[PDB]
Paper text:
Here, we present structural information for the human antibody PN-[name]’s heterosubtypic binding of hemagglutinin (HA) from circulating and emerging potential influenza A viruses (IAVs). The globular HA head domain recognizes host proteins bearing sialic acid on their surface, while the HA stem triggers the fusion of viral and host membranes following endocytosis, allowing release of viral contents into the cell. Anti-stem antibodies exhibit much broader cross-subtype neutralizing activity in vitro and in vivo by inhibiting the low pH-induced HA conformational rearrangement, hence blocking membrane fusion. In our structures, we found that each Fab variable fragment interacts with just one protomer of the HA trimer, and PN-[name] recognized conserved residues in the stem region of HA by binding in a very similar orientation to the HAs.
PN-[name] had a large number of somatic mutations in both VH3-30*01 and VK1-12*01 genes compared to the unmutated common ancestor, and has a long heavy chain complementarity determining region 3 (CDRH3) (16 amino acids). We determined the structures of the PN-[name] Fab fragment alone at 2.5 Å and of its Fab variable fragment complexes with H1, H14, or H18 HA at 3.2, 3.4, and 2.6 Å resolution, respectively. The high-resolution structures of the PN-[name] Fab alone and PN-[name] Fab variable fragment in complex with H18 HA allow us to analyze conformational changes of PN-[name] upon HA binding in detail. The structural alignment of PN-[name] and PN-[name]/H18 reveal that their CDR conformations are almost identical, except for CDRH3. The CDRH3 loop formed by residues 97-100 G undergoes a largely rigid-body rotation, pivoted around S96 (CDRH3) and L100H (CDRH3) to facilitate interactions with HA. Additionally, the side chain of F103 (CDRH3) moves by 4.5 Å to fit into the hydrophobic groove of the epitope. The structural characterization of PN-[name] bound and unbound structures highlights its long and flexible CDRH3, which can accommodate the differences in conformation and environment in the hydrophobic grove of the HA. Given that the CDRL conformations in PN-[name] bound and unbound structures are almost the same and CDRLs in PN-[name]/HA complexes only interact with Helix A of different HAs, the different Helix A orientations in different HAs cause them bind to different CDRLs.
Author numbering:
A (entry chain A): 1 to 226
B (entry chain B): 1 to 214
Write the structure that this text describes.
């Protein structure tokens, strides 16, 4: 009922601009102050900007002063965050948040009642690139055995994310798809692994399905022992 | 600028346990401290404001206390849906400030990792770069040390690590380590090894292959 809908995120090269939007519904919008909060991947929460209910007073973190501009539109019940001179340090998921009232009293400084779903901002000089997919072949140092491990190296793609399934979804037990790491080149790389019984090798085929929609890339890599 | 310091950074507990998280401020914030809950992929969720006032709908097992500089969040009996990250927030003054966060994890018995090493594929070798991957599978607790060695030479600055969350069925972790070399460097040496130090191991486990077909 009461919710904040966000939009405007995306991938942008360093030094460019972006404008975030937060549309409110279900509550009196222009009675509340409003805040923008961001959270870098793996990091914690950081407040970036706030504005009073009437738009007369605006507050900024030191990290964004002179660069970010907060504003609001009462007719549209919409909150804005104009972000200029973006740098990779600004890569995060951005939220709009509403300070909680205390028994009818609207205070801009309180715990944050309601949060938007978030919109992701990526600041990178990298260009869209499909992943290279390499097999992590299962091994042996005898002929028979117990449980074997095989996997899929999804390397050098941009931007996030890639989806990985095994045998078109028929293989889910023992699967670990690891979070991507950001390499020095600016491209991402992750690996998906699965543990199988050693009797399966040779009899059962293992196919790793990698989809990267930003580049319309779809790869089916069969992983067999060398 | 007021800075908040949460303690501890993480805690492992079982369902039914009593968990106590503290938040310390560099200045006095009277009673303008809020507590949040966050699960991966979702926005934060307010639990406490005014340092003791429960949000509407939040279970009564969540209690907040304290004033001035020292504060405390308490969960009187942990429930399965309470394993998440918890943040304190200061609302005494601008700028608004969050604590580093406290992650409450599922406690279980020690589990030693299964270690696997994977040589680079021949398809990648044609591109001019080689990636050796090492897998640590289903271990607990999370603390582990992976050291790469090539011809017994300890590597530095050419590897990256990635860890999953606790598995939904056995509460263990898994870890992937990727050593990245140039093909010329890779063909220049023979034995590639992955050394794993974990408290479930009496001695470090090393897995190794040697380049060729061995």
């Amino acid at each position: 009922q009461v919710q904040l809908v966000e939009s405007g995120g995306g991938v942008v090269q360093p030094g460019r601009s972006l404008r975030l939007s937060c549309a409110a519904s279900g509550f009196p919008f222009s009675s509340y102050g409003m805040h923008w909060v961001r959270q870098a991947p793996g990091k914690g929460l950081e407040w970036v900007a706030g504005v009073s209910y009437d738009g007369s007073y605006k507050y900024y973190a030191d990290s964004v002063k002179g660069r970010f501009t907060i504003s609001r539109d009462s007719s549209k019940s919409t909150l804005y965050l104009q972000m200029n001179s973006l740098r990779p340090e600004d890569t995060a998921v951005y939220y709009c948040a509403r300070p909680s009232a205390i028994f009818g009293i609207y205070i801009i400084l309180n715990g944050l009642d309601v949060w938007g779903q978030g919109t992701t901002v990526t600041v990178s000089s990298a260009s869209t690139k499909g992943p290279s997919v390499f097999p992590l072949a299962p091994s042996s140092k005898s002929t028979s055995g117990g449980t074997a491990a095989l996997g899929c190296l999804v390397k050098d793609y941009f931007p996030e994310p890639v989806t990985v399934s095994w045998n078109s979804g028929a293989l889910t037990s023992g699967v670990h798809t690891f979070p991507a790491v950001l390499q020095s080149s600016g491209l991402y790389s992750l690996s998906s692994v699965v543990t199988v019984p050693s009797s399966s090798l040779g009899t059962q085929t293992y196919i790793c399905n990698v989809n990267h929609k930003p580049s319309n890339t779809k790869v089916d890599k069969k992983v067999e022992p060398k | 600028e007021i800075v908040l310091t949460q303690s501890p950074s993480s805690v492992s507990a079982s369902v039914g346990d009593r968990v106590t998280i503290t938040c310390r401020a560099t200045q006095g914030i009277s009673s303008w401290l809020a507590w949040y809950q966050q699960k991966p992929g979702k926005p934060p969720k307010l639990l406490i404001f005014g340092a003791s006032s429960l949000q509407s709908g939040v279970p009564s097992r969540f209690s907040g206390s304290g004033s001035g500089t020292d504060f405390t969040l308490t969960i009187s009996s942990l429930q399965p849906e309470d394993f998440a990250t918890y943040f304190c927030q200061q609302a005494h003054s601008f700028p608004l400030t969050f604590g580093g966060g406290t992650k409450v994890e599922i406690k279980r018995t020690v589990a030693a990792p299964s270690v696997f090493i994977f040589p680079p594929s021949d398809e990648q070798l044609k591109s001019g770069t080689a990636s050796v991957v090492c897998l640590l599978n289903n271990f607990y607790p999370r603390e582990a040390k992976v050291q790469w060695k090539v011809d017994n030479a300890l590597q530095s600055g050419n590897s990256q690590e990635s860890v999953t969350e606790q598995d939904s069925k056995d509460s263990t972790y898994s870890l992937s380590s990727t050593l990245t070399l140039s093909k010329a460097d890779y063909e220049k040496h023979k034995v590639y090894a992955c050394e794993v130090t974990h408290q479930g191991l009496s001695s470090p486990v090393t897995k190794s292959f040697n380049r060729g077909e061995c």
